[PDB]
Amino acid sequence: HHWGYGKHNGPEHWHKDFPIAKGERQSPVDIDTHTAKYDPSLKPLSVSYDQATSLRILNNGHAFNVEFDDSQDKAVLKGGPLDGTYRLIQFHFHWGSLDGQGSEHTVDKKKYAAELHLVHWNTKYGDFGKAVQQPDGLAVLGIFLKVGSAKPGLQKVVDVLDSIKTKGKSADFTNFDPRGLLPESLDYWTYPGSLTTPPLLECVTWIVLKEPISVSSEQVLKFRKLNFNGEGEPEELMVDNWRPAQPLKNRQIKASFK
Ligand SMILES: NS(O)(O)c1ccc(-n2cc(COc3ccccc3)nn2)cc1
Ligand SMILES: [Zn+2]
Q1: d(CA 145, CA 180)
Q2: With b meaning 16 or more CB within 10 Å and e meaning fewer, what string describes 73-84?
Q3: Which residues contact 2 (CB under 8 A, 6 or more apart)?
Q4: Is 34 marked active-site?
Q5: Which residues does ligand 1 sit against, CB inside 6 Å?
Q6: In the chain, after which residues does the backbone break, taking C–N over 2.5 angstroms as a break?
Q7: What are the binding residues?
Q8: Options 3.90.180.10, 3.30.390.10, 3.30.499.10, 3.10.200.10; which CATH number does 1-258 get?
Q9: Measuring CA to CA, how many Å separate 52 from each of 28, 66, 74, 206, 238?
């Protein structure tokens, strides 16, 4: 009886195995745009993905991860609220069964169709496993998806999903350029939070871009054909793999923009 996104194992049950689920800096949160304060001391984000080396795509039973070679400073995130250098390890998405839900963060209570998470770890801690034990161990760049025009840079991801339909399946996924998933603007909100799945560790500086990317209905429909289950098991579509907004508690969300 493992955690997931069903009625008997979903987000409202996670606290039983992971008591930090009710902690002081849990994610995601609702971003109240009128309460978020412009912080003129925040720097522009530095997203340096030109040397990114993608390796593999994996259905882990909760989402799919596009994994990168993080054994050198290839693809890194710096600046903004961050001190030091954060190395890209993987990206994944959360999405809904319908276009009106799917994102983890919300903006004035608005839910987007999906949310992209580019996960980075602070290189002062040496490895990802050590980084997640630190309050400034990870930086996750979150990007909202809305349904409209297709995102050309997403299609290579979409087209490999048939080969990783079920939990535990992976496929080679080299030479994928994550720069093709970014919006035009790097304006962002930032706050201290957590992993949004178990183990829910409070180790993340969240950087959530204001500008969503547009993906087509056909692209998101292919996300929704994935399976939570393993091969040869009863089919359960991988949809609604998002955690709802958690209490903000003693936190302030800062904006990089006026
Ligand atoms: N959705 S998210 O907040 O971007 C998010 C990002 C990453 C994770 N996540 C969970 C795990 C699995 O937990 C680990 C704990 C210690 C060392 C290694 C792995 N590894 N990564 C969970 C959620
Ligand atoms: Zn995520």
Answers
A1: 13
A2: ebbbbbebbbee
A3: 9
A4: no
A5: 117, 119, 128-129, 132, 140, 195-197, 199
A6: none
A7: 92, 94, 117, 196-197
A8: 3.10.200.10
A9: 27, 12, 5, 21, 28
